[PDB]
Amino acid sequence: VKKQLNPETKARIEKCLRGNILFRSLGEDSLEVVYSSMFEKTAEAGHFIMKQYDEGDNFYVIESGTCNILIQPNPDAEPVHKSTIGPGASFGELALMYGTPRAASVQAVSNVRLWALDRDTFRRILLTQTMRKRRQYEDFLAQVPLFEALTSYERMTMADALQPCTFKDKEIVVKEGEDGGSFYIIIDGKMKVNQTLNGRIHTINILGPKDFFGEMSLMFNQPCVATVVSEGVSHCVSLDRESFTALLGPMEEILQRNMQNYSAPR
Numbered sequence: 378v379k380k381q382l383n384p385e386t387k388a389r390i391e392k393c394l395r396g397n398i399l400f401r402s403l404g405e406d407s408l409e410v411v412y413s414s415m416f417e418k419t420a421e422a423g424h425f426i427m428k429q430y431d432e433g434d435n436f437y438v439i440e441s442g443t444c445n446i447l448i449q450p451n452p453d454a455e456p457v458h459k460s461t462i463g464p465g466a467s468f469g470e471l472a473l474m475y476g477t478p479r480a481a482s483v484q485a486v487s488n489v490r491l492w493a494l495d496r497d498t499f500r501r502i503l504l505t506q507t508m509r510k511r512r513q514y515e516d517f518l519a520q521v522p523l524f525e526a527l528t529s530y531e532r533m534t535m536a537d538a539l540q541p542c543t544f545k546d547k548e549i550v551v552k553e554g555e556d557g558g559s560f561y562i563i564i565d566g567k568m569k570v571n572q573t574l575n576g577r578i579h580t581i582n583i584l585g586p587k588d589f590f591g592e593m594s595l596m597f598n599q600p601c602v603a604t605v606v607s608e609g610v611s612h613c614v615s616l617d618r619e620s621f622t623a624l625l626g627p628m629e630e631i632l633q634r635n636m637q638n639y640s641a642p643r
């Protein structure tokens with residue numbers, strides 16, 4: 378004897394939550410809680426959904442409209458624009474996780490439609506695994522050159538998005554000629570980078586801890602120019618195409634510079 382979801386509201390929430398990585402991870406039982414618990418909130422253009430330093434109440438996902446993230450350096454100072462977010466983006470988790478006052482104001486730019494979880498529901502289904510994942514990858518993200526330019530909050534969202542993957546000896550990760558799927562950063566292990574020429578395979582590069590690969594197919598929407606294959610057991614984390622593209626900003630210059638190592642210059 379349990380209350381039934383409204384299948385139409387479930388479909389609507391699912392459409393909004395597609396691609397948000399915090400909800401993609403939840404298993405089916407927690408998803409049932411989300412689909413029965415989330416509620417609608419609207420905000421007119423220019424109105425604040427939350428103000429920096431407020432006590433936390435809800436966690437939000439944008440359904441329609443865009444919002445500005447504004448951060449003051451202190452309560453007596455003017456807010457600075459930091460970023461603009463839109464459909465599928467979430468905000469408001471930090472206060473609910475860490476018990477801190479809100480770290481930013483969030484202002485509707487357009488009229489906005491949101492789906493919201495209250496604090497008790499957030500604590501039940503999202504708090505534990507979100508906090509753990511961010512903690513577990515903090516040291517890694519701070520010491521990998523690829524991530525040098527990420528802000529502290531960008532590190533947290535990068536941790537949310539990264540997916541662990543394990544590769545056995547001789548296992549192919551990306552195959553020359555195939556469409557790009559994911560971007561990989563090596564935690565431990567070793568990869569051979571192999572490329573065919575006149576029907577002969579040769580090894581053109583060797584990758585190890587904190588190196589990365591798979592970016593060119595995703596950045597330029599083209600097939601992989603090489604095969605990357607594990608040499609022994611390797612542990613990586615990956616970003617899928619959608620997450621790579623969403624989070625590319627603070628990485629792009631490092632990724633572009635690094636391509637210098639792929640060919641002698643002219």
Ligand SMILES: Nc1ncnc2c1ncn2[C@@H]1O[C@@H]2COP(=O)(O)O[C@H]2[C@H]1O
Nearest residue numbers: 446468469470471472473479480481530
């Ligand atoms: N650079 C940022 N720094 C801190 N919080 C941010 C930032 N960008 C977006 N946010 C979101 O803004 C929210 C404001 O309230 P919270 O601090 O509960 O959680 C915060 C994050 O979800």
Ligand SMILES: Nc1ncnc2c1ncn2[C@@H]1O[C@@H]2COP(=O)(O)O[C@H]2[C@H]1O
Nearest residue numbers: 570582590591592593594601602603639
């Ligand atoms: N010399 C190299 N030339 C081309 N790609 C390389 C080289 N060394 C490592 N790689 C990586 O191999 C990857 C194979 O797939 P991508 O083309 O998506 O991006 C490529 C780079 O990340």
